[PDB]
Amino acid sequence: QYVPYKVKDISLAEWGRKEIELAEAEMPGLMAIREEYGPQQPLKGARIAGCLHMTIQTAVLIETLVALGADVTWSSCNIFSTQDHAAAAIAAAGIPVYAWKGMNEEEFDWCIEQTLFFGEDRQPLNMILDDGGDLTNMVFDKYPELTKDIKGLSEETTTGVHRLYERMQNGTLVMPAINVNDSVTKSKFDNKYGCRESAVDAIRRATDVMLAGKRVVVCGFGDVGKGTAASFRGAGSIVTVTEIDPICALQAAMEGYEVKQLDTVVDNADIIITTTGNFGIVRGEHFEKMKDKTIVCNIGHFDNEIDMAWLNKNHGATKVEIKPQVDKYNVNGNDIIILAEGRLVNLGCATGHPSFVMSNSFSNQTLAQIELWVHSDKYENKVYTLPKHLDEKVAALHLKKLGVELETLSEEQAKYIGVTVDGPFKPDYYRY
Amino acid sequence: QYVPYKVKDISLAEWGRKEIELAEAEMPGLMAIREEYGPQQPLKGARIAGCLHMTIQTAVLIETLVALGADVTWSSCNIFSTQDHAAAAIAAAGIPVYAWKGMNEEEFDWCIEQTLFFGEDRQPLNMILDDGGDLTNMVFDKYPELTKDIKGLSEETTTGVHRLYERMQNGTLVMPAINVNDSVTKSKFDNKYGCRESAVDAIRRATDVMLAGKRVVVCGFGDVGKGTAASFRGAGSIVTVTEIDPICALQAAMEGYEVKQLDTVVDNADIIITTTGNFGIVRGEHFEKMKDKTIVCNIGHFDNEIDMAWLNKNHGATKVEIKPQVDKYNVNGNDIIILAEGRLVNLGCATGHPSFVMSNSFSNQTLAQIELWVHSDKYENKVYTLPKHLDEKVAALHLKKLGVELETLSEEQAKYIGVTVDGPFKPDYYRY
Amino acid sequence: QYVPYKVKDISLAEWGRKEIELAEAEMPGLMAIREEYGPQQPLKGARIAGCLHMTIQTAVLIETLVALGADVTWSSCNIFSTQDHAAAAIAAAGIPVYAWKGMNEEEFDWCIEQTLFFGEDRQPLNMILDDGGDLTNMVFDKYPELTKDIKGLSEETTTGVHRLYERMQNGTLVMPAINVNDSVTKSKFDNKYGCRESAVDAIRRATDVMLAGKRVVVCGFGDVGKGTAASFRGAGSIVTVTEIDPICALQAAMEGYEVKQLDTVVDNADIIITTTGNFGIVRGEHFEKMKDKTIVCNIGHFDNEIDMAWLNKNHGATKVEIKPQVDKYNVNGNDIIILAEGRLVNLGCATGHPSFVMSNSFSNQTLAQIELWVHSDKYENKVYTLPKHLDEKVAALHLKKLGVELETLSEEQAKYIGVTVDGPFKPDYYRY
Amino acid sequence: QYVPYKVKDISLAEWGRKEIELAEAEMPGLMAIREEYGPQQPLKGARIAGCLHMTIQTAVLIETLVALGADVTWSSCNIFSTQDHAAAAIAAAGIPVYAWKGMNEEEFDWCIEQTLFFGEDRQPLNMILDDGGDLTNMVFDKYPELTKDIKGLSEETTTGVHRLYERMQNGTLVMPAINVNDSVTKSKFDNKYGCRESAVDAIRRATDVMLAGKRVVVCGFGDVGKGTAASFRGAGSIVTVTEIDPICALQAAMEGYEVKQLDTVVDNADIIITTTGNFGIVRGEHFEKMKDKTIVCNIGHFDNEIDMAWLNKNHGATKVEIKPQVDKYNVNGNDIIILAEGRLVNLGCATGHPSFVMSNSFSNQTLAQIELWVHSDKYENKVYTLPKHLDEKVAALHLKKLGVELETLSEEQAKYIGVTVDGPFKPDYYRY
Numbered sequence A, B, C, D: 001q002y003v004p005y006k007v008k009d010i011s012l013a014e015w016g017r018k019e020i021e022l023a024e025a026e027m028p029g030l031m032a033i034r035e036e037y038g039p040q041q042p043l044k045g046a047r048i049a050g051c052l053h054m055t056i057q058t059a060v061l062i063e064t065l066v067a068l069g070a071d072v073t074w075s076s077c078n079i080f081s082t083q084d085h086a087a088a089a090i091a092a093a094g095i096p097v098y099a100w101k102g103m104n105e106e107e108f109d110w111c112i113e114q115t116l117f118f119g120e121d122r123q124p125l126n127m128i129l130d131d132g133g134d135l136t137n138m139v140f141d142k143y144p145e146l147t148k149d150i151k152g153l154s155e156e157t158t159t160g161v162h163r164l165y166e167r168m169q170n171g172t173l174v175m176p177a178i179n180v181n182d183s184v185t186k187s188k189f190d191n192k193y194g195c196r197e198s199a200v201d202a203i204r205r206a207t208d209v210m211l212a213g214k215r216v217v218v219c220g221f222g223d224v225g226k227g228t229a230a231s232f233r234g235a236g237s238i239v240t241v242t243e244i245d246p247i248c249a250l251q252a253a254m255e256g257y258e259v260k261q262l263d264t265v266v267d268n269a270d271i272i273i274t275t276t277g278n279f280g281i282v283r284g285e286h287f288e289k290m291k292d293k294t295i296v297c298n299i300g301h302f303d304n305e306i307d308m309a310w311l312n313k314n315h316g317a318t319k320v321e322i323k324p325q326v327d328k329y330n331v332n333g334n335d336i337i338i339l340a341e342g343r344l345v346n347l348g349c350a351t352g353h354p355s356f357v358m359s360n361s362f363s364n365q366t367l368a369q370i371e372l373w374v375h376s377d378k379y380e381n382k383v384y385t386l387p388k389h390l391d392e393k394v395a396a397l398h399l400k401k402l403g404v405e406l407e408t409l410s411e412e413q414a415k416y417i418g419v420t421v422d423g424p425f426k427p428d429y430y431r432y
């Protein structure tokens, strides 16, 4: 039977609403887009299923989509990332949301599947909004009959984008897709500066440990690794980076970090955090070398960066929960502290990124949903990014809140550098 | 009638004990002092009343004093700083503790008064361990008859030390006192690096706001102000400092901060945090100038740095609690967000300093209690500090945990610079 | 008549050679390329005219090209950037170099023109190696008859690349061109980290001023602006950034800088430095507002970022040379200090970037010259970049010198993220 | 016969004067003291011999003393620290100065001895102004007959202060002495922030090496070590600190540096710089372990921190001068680069600290000379410091130049914290 929503505790809605109102003031881009596109109702007729961490920030995105005319259903893309008071507030607003903090895997799948059908009539979704690819996979692999009537999808994160390029190479991408991750105002702000805000936050809330003087190994120096390393360095930690990519490794050395193999530094590390989007970064052989009370955690999208299966099989019998999402294992006499069972730690042990940086990602997300819903016929079954002018517009919408003033080119200065006075200001290859 | 303890929820003890065990590993100085002085039972016969934030870290101090032979009673020195699971664990260990998070002022006084008498026999305390001076004032002002049999007191923080110098000038200091605040390993580590760890932590847990690009006004640039400014700068904030002292102001300018009057910067500040130990820093006239959703908080010892009386009198009728210790007031159309009702915010909205830095303060605290209990007859009714050799010993006890190696002077190098090979290494005027 | 070289003082060669030998040890990429391609003589038959700051670093590039088989002639692309002992050493090695520090504009052109013809026979060049486009313009505009026998050109810097895209749009690019600037290992290392090394260096050598606590306005926050801002911030300055581009402006705010219009901050600035590659950044109206003894300088390619014509016309009569390339003007009673007559200040008042970062740029430059000389027939009269594998190779060649260790993907980890174990590791759109 | 001055080249005076005028604008404290005390001629009758690095900054000090009524003679306290154009300008002003860059030791002593007698009449000095103790030792040890008529001495640096405490313990301090080093506005600004400005400066001018990613070993973490470590960290270097003092070592770990024995890190260091004021820090056994082209230098007062005797005895025969004060030795196949022959490197290879920070030290120096000349009868043959009010006054005189605004206490706020509204604001034990 139809289930209108499912949340941990609907009585948390009042608290969630108070925090949503504060978040709105910190998300000027989303609120400006609400205001500019509200009158036009661009998303009228859309039935968007979203699969994205059910946080206070996501609530503002959800209510922006509704404000633009859409019908929306929602689930979280991680079992530990929902903020229960945010979910309760969205449920109390009449929006079908299926999400709570601490789901098991069967519940996680069940929540996604509820979002595919709208109302008692079970009307199918016609738009996909994804973070990591699990909703995309659910529809494409388990409900392929529905794709004929879905106009397109947007994908929010690096890991889900890679899965979309797997599908292109495999001939299994059956609709247009906009890669929101690689808007400049997403990748270079959310992935990097968002993790700078929220990585140390999660370690502090989980463990309360002193960070100054601790040796922190950051595995990876992509956008998440850059921000995560900066997070700990700004708290006084001594950060060593690992990398496979010689360009990213040289960047870390130029920023004043040592860059070593994990095997070189594992036996003296105080904290190890993975940022790679790969698998098998922290293995049984590494756990066997760690010193007592080493904290191990992951801020990449999936928990398989850390071999939790090995740890639970070999040392799970004497696992002790310190408190929820802070587990202590004993490996041959040395305690190992695992945060959020190896799941993305900033959302699992804290609240993820702050509202202001998520306003950039979610402004891109909203513009992508508009573009697909209105203009999907103009696109092939390939992966696209938003045009640079829209990327620039998203950034510009956040400047007044910060007291940032921009210069204005004269027409002659603009011609001198080969641009127009209203932009775009950079060639499409520019890397910022 | 005698009350053996009073805590919020004794069933939190198991969780508290798990966190105490983790804290012990992060407090090598305290555990080393336990180990060195345990066999000697130096505190046998002592009945120490302590008045100090009832945190996990304080639990390790309490159990160190007991391990050294003392009987101990305890209360918190702030109405919001107790960690209820730490209090429960100490209560379950059989130690008289009277403390919970969120006391009112009548309860705060009642808790202190219970600590003055030991057991059903109501045996009076004979040692004072204080943080801020309220326990000292309670005994000296309200129970003066008890001071004849108290061997001495130690005082942990800058504000309580100043009160002790008031008493010296006033002829009302009636026992020897050791100033633990001004051990180098306390003032220059706890006050500064501890606030670097815990100031931003509290703002994040309370508000989840983005700190990068925010204008943060840090009022004061003493040890707490230096650490607090560093806290926000390391998170990407744009910090402006205020000061009355031209030397401290010049330090802030040399560290790359603007230094302005609060009146110059109040109307564009995103966060204002007071660190002065003074009163009347943030006044009604300042609230009237703040922009919408400015966060105002205090990390000095007492809440009177912010004129909360003015704010509650003039705008309390429409106060909204966002969540506990996060209050929203509307001042002439602009929201003002107050953290922890103006009480010390790192303990009120987070967990205070981390264990490792508190091990330095509490190692000094333990050595001071030993020195007074054993050698109080060798002291006048004046304020003293521990000798530099003990200060150096405290620092040395924390080096191995961090992987710090020290050089050893040859006898000839030691003579060259005028020291002995075992220290002390600096003249008593050295400022570090 | 043929002139074999022209330098300030050939007796500086011994000193130049000693510094070249030290630079070789700091340029592992260039020396590795020498070693790998030396036996193959890939540049046999090439007659490369180079127009690029005649520094110690450029000497190692010149001798690498010769080591690979090329005949080379050389001039500097700026009137103040030659290091006379580097020029003398190259002249003493028998290489035709025409360059000294402090040329006038007629001499600058004369030096370029000598490089176009090789030996007493006046054999024409057949390869162009340019930095800024002035050599390209000299050949294309003044000696167009020579382009038929030139196989291609490489261009090293952002400003010259823009000129190449002007030529493409104008139908005046008559040979293949490789954009070396936008190798990742050039733009994201030289432009950014190189200016971090050398911007403050130049201000210190020129003026010896205290940088801590000074208000520095960095105009622009592209790669040069990012590095320049970091240069001054790391010295304790209080940096404000200006920008036209909302994405770059938001980056600066997220990095903890205020971002304002120059007009907002000009009257209180202590140092103003331009990084834009535009013109007309610092105008007469700005000079009229500056406070006494403000230092004004430019680190973009051309001096027209600052309106030096206005300053010399209106206030040149009382100009005082403090020392060479440090000039003091009096504007309505306030002194203005101009560095290097507004020409790129890191090369004009110091020695430009250090050897290690120039090894990255010049490794790319060498590989580009090889690719064009060997494979120019495979290219159209368009602008190209080197493939990502070569970019990665350049970075990898510099890791051992720094003690950087790289992880190696398993074949299964490589397939998981969609790469091969030997790279390239990132999609072509990746921005680092 | 009497010699009126001795400098390298008097024709450098015009250049020196231009730079002195710029320095005056950067030394508001000295110029304010000139202005306040000029009318009173407090130093009338004084004959001050100064022995202090003959830099542009020292020229402003010299001319301030003359402006206050004193007769002055001067020499430099280091063989490499004189700025010849500063010396020429002072000589051209009619002031007896005996100093040039690159003296030998016999010349160094000869210069000091000329300063002891004034004019053709050979009138003896009656005031000593010293930096390091060599002038003090010259008078006390070689001209003891003169001390009866010298009213007192001031001493500027940590090393000379220690020598004064040696003399107190030895009963050989025969006049009052003011320790200028340990004014707060000297030790905590000059020693620390001055070296932050000038340590990296010297390495860049001498070697032009890339600092990002280099491993720099800073020996010592006193005030000079703190500033020197910050210098290199702000340039992107990876700094490891060495220490004998557990408090200073813990400070470095809390600031995010590794802290190791030199023996642990010597074989992989790129730069080693000594800051201890001790001897025998870098020994033959260390040189034998260094890798090729390691840069070794010293920023403590005396060159014996590095065993230059060992290096010259064992490897001097193949020493190569790269350029003046940059020497290359070959130790068993590895090149070692020595800066300034091991003498204080910021003055030997660059220009020492900038004017603004020296204005703080030299404002203290001027007030100390006034206090001794006027009030020496009120002092014993002991070491004294200036009162805190004068320390605060010195800092306050530099605030307007930086745009620093100070708050003003109300009388009630002042009483609350136990001070007066005009200061002093801190107890005498305060460490800042």
Ligand SMILES: NC(=O)c1ccc[n+]([C@@H]2O[C@H](COP(=O)([O-])OP(=O)(O)OC[C@H]3O[C@@H](n4cnc5c(N)ncnc54)[C@H](O)[C@@H]3O)[C@@H](O)[C@H]2O)c1
Pocket: A157, A158, A159, A160, A190, A191, A194, A195, A219, A220, A221, A222, A223, A224, A225, A242, A243, A244, A245, A248, A275, A276, A277, A278, A281, A299, A300, A301, A302, A344, A345, A346, A347, A352, A353, C407, C409, C413, C425
């Ligand atoms: N938790 C968050 O809030 C958050 C935010 C954004 C993205 N993400 C996720 O974080 C992950 C990383 O994202 P990104 O944008 O930084 O990707 P990225 O491609 O920019 O960076 C990943 C880096 O990992 C490196 N790497 C790969 N395998 C490695 C190995 N074996 N050892 C060391 N380094 C290795 C790569 O060379 C690359 O530089 C993805 O899973 C992404 O979805 C999480």
Ligand SMILES: NC(=O)c1ccc[n+]([C@@H]2O[C@H](COP(=O)([O-])OP(=O)(O)OC[C@H]3O[C@@H](n4cnc5c(N)ncnc54)[C@H](O)[C@@H]3O)[C@@H](O)[C@H]2O)c1
Pocket: B157, B158, B159, B160, B190, B191, B194, B195, B219, B220, B221, B222, B223, B224, B225, B242, B243, B244, B245, B248, B275, B276, B277, B278, B281, B299, B300, B301, B302, B344, B345, B346, B347, B352, B353, D407, D409, D413, D425
């Ligand atoms: N929350 C914590 O964990 C924590 C830690 C240590 C100390 N403390 C408390 O914090 C406070 C500050 O301690 P501290 O050690 O930094 O003291 P401090 O004396 O070193 O610094 C206080 C600073 O405030 C400045 N100041 C005074 N009045 C001012 C005003 N009107 N405007 C601007 N600046 C002003 C003073 O000049 C001084 O530099 C005290 O109340 C102390 O007990 C709290």
Ligand SMILES: NC(=O)c1ccc[n+]([C@@H]2O[C@H](COP(=O)([O-])OP(=O)(O)OC[C@H]3O[C@@H](n4cnc5c(N)ncnc54)[C@H](O)[C@@H]3O)[C@@H](O)[C@H]2O)c1
Pocket: A407, A409, A413, A425, C157, C158, C159, C160, C190, C191, C194, C195, C219, C220, C221, C222, C223, C224, C225, C242, C243, C244, C245, C248, C275, C276, C277, C278, C281, C299, C300, C301, C302, C344, C345, C346, C347, C352, C353
């Ligand atoms: N001196 C050096 O060693 C060195 C090194 C590399 C490049 N360069 C030169 O430096 C210049 C900048 O190079 P880049 O790679 O940073 O280019 P870029 O395109 O990455 O950055 C230039 C920035 O200037 C900004 N800008 C343009 N007009 C502006 C204005 N009126 N006000 C404020 N900002 C404005 C643009 O938005 C852009 O972000 C070029 O001339 C380049 O050739 C010099």
Ligand SMILES: NC(=O)c1ccc[n+]([C@@H]2O[C@H](COP(=O)([O-])OP(=O)(O)OC[C@H]3O[C@@H](n4cnc5c(N)ncnc54)[C@H](O)[C@@H]3O)[C@@H](O)[C@H]2O)c1
Pocket: B407, B409, B413, B425, D157, D158, D159, D160, D190, D191, D194, D195, D219, D220, D221, D222, D223, D224, D225, D242, D243, D244, D245, D248, D275, D276, D277, D278, D281, D299, D300, D301, D302, D344, D345, D346, D347, D352, D353
């Ligand atoms: N070059 C400059 O401009 C400049 C400026 C100020 C002072 N100085 C000189 O620099 C030196 C240091 O001055 P300071 O004020 O920092 O003194 P300081 O006493 O504050 O610091 C010296 C530090 O060296 C440490 N140390 C001693 N022997 C050591 C060893 N064997 N290994 C490691 N660490 C060791 C000590 O523990 C101490 O912390 C003195 O010679 C002083 O005169 C130079």
Ligand SMILES: Nc1ncnc2c1ncn2[C@@H]1O[C@H](CO)[C@@H](O)[C@H]1O
Pocket: A052, A053, A054, A055, A056, A057, A058, A131, A132, A156, A157, A158, A190, A194, A301, A344, A347, A351, A352, A353, A354, A358, A361
């Ligand atoms: N507070 C948050 N709310 C929603 N999504 C978030 C939050 N913090 C991080 N994320 C997102 O989580 C993704 C990782 O799956 C990142 O792409 C990032 O955009």
Ligand SMILES: Nc1ncnc2c1ncn2[C@@H]1O[C@H](CO)[C@@H](O)[C@H]1O
Pocket: B052, B053, B054, B055, B056, B057, B058, B131, B132, B156, B157, B158, B190, B194, B301, B344, B347, B351, B352, B353, B354, B358, B361
């Ligand atoms: N976690 C903590 N436990 C106990 N005391 C703390 C903690 N964090 C800060 N403090 C103390 O609170 C005092 C302020 O009253 C400071 O002197 C500091 O030592």
Ligand SMILES: Nc1ncnc2c1ncn2[C@@H]1O[C@H](CO)[C@@H](O)[C@H]1O
Pocket: C052, C053, C054, C055, C056, C057, C058, C131, C132, C156, C157, C158, C190, C194, C301, C344, C347, C351, C352, C353, C354, C358, C361
């Ligand atoms: N030391 C140096 N030698 C040669 N070129 C340099 C040096 N420092 C900077 N440059 C170059 O100058 C160019 C600006 O015209 C930049 O692209 C950069 O590569």
Ligand SMILES: Nc1ncnc2c1ncn2[C@@H]1O[C@H](CO)[C@@H](O)[C@H]1O
Pocket: D052, D053, D054, D055, D056, D057, D058, D131, D132, D156, D157, D158, D190, D194, D301, D344, D347, D351, D352, D353, D354, D358, D361
């Ligand atoms: N530019 C300078 N002029 C004069 N003295 C200086 C300069 N830079 C550093 N010093 C001084 O050199 C001393 C070391 O002998 C330090 O105490 C410091 O005050």
